[PDB]
Structures are given as structure tokens and as C-alpha cells.
């Protein structure tokens, strides 16, 4: 996260770190959506242009964390993966359309003060909250700058951007399964996700029922926090039929 701030303790209890084995490193962010299911970006797990192709046994999920590098004894919980499910129409060739994957954990995780699931939006949630100017929150342990690494989980609040402005900021084809967020050059304020934050959650707090909903998944940006560029997020509600289908089947 670029130009964010340190998270408070328990501020994002659905935050999940995807942690690679051999070599021990940050793989991506993710989010906890039940005691057994974690949500992330497909390109975190499968991305042929960068020779990324992680299998179940290559990584661990670390839930309830705050410090990036510490082993947070008695606070974090480390889970092994049972199965990865990547969207079958994930478009890694062109534009990261449907950049979304689920991971089922071998064993349910116990909830605590630091570990707790986020809600997924329904159609009404999306229609009311996913509007230009409305802000959500992005969290992660990714790089502080495009060109170092944080001590603790970072947080930034960012406004959703109008779809034409999103489209006009990039040469990439932007689909209805994506939205973009971030400040415009003349808004003054700054902030973005960066390398290591992909897969993490873009959340909003509904003012109707005072619950947090994961509206987006951190997907991609042209660099990080560049003037006139925005971050692109997977639109979770548009992919919810797929999410439900996977959880219901497996």
C-alpha cells in the first residue's frame, strides 16, 4: 500500500496473508469469507506471463496477522489449503477479467478478536454502494512505493471512480467485471495498492446495516500511485453467482 497508514489492531480481521514456502515470502493478500473459505485474485495463483502457477502445497494461509514478518504467536492462525478454485473464465491473456479465485482450507479456522469473516454483497448492496465518489478501504502488506516494505498491515481509503474516467486512464480493455478507484490528480490526496497487495479486499461499511462488505478484490494498476492512473478491482458482486456455485458444490 502506497501513501496509506498503519492498521489499528483488529481493524481488518478478515485480512489474510498468502505466504509462500521455499522461499518464505509474501505471495499476495486474500480475505476470509467463512470459517473454511478464503477469497483472492486468480493472478496471485496462476499467471503464465510471469511463470506463476502455485499449487495447494506451495503456500499457507496466515489469518489474524498485523506484523508483516513476525510469527504472531497466540494471535495468528496458519492454515493449509485443501483446494484452489480459479474462475474458469479468468482472462490472464489480456486484461485480468474475472481475476478471482477461492481457496478451501483443510480445517475450519476458529474466529477470535483478530479473525472474523467479511460479508459479500448482494445485488442491492452493490447498487447502493458501488458508486463514483463513494470510498472503500484497501489493506495489505505490499510495497510502500512502486520503486520499502511495511512493518505492519497498511490501510488506505480510496474513492470509486466513474467508468469513463477509468477507461480513459489506460489502454487496457476494462470490463463490467472490474471497477477502478483512487484520487484524481487535482483531488490532491494520494494512495494506491502496490506489489504484494493483489488479492486483498476492497471493503465498504454499509450505512444501512453497519456491516463491512467486500466489494472488490485488489487486481492491478499501471505502476502504483501514479498521477492519472487508478487501481482496478474485481467486482465481487458480478462474480457472486460463481462464488456461491463453488461453495455450494464443494
Amino acid at each position: 500500500i502506497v501513501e496509506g497508514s498503519d492498521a489499528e489492531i483488529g481493524m481488518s480481521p478478515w485480512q489474510v496473508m498468502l505466504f509462500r514456502k521455499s522461499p518464505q515470502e509474501l505471495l499476495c493478500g486474500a480475505s476470509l469469507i467463512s470459517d473454511r473459505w478464503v477469497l483472492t485474485a486468480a493472478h496471485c495463483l496462476l499467471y503464465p506471463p510471469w511463470d506463476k502457477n502455485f499449487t495447494e502445497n506451495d503456500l499457507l494461509v496466515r489469518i489474524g496477522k498485523h506484523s508483516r514478518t513476525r510469527y504472531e504467536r497466540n494471535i495468528e492462525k496458519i492454515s493449509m489449503l485443501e483446494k484452489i478454485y480459479i474462475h474458469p473464465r479468468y482472462n490472464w491473456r489480456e486484461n485480468l477479467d474475472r481475476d478471482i479465485a477461492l481457496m478451501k482450507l483443510k480445517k475450519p479456522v476458529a474466529f477470535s478478536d483478530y479473525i472474523h469473516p467479511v460479508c459479500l454483497p448482494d445485488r442491492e448492496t452493490a447498487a447502493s454502494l458501488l458508486q463514483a465518489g463513494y470510498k472503500g478501504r484497501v489493506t495489505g502488506w505490499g510495497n510502500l512505493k512502486e520503486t520499502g516494505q511495511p512493518s505492519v498491515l497498511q490501510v488506505v481509503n480510496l474513492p470509486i471512480v466513474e467508468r469513463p474516467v477509468c477507461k480513459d486512464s489506460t489502454r487496457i480493455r476494462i470490463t463490467d467485471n472490474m471497477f477502478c478507484a483512487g484520487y484524481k490528480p487535482d483531488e490532491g490526496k494520494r494512495g494506491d495498492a502496490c506489489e504484494g497487495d493483489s488479492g486483498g479486499p476492497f471493503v465498504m461499511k454499509s450505512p444501512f446495516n453497519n456491516r463491512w462488505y467486500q466489494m472488490g478484490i485488489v487486481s492491478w494498476g499501471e505502476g502504483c500511485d501514479r498521477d492519472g492512473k487508478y487501481g482496478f478491482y474485481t467486482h465481487v458482486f458480478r462474480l457472486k453467482k460463481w462464488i456461491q456455485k463453488v461453495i455450494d458444490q464443494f
Binding site: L60, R68, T69, Y71, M80, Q149
Partner: peptide, 11 residues
């Protein structure tokens, strides 16, 4: 790297 070893029950 920068990461503190995890208990190798997870590994």
C-alpha cells in the same frame, strides 16, 4: 528473508 520462522507443524 525478512520472515520469522513459523513453527514447522505448519510446514
Amino acid at each position: 528473508g525478512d520472515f520469522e520462522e513459523i513453527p514447522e507443524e505448519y510446514l
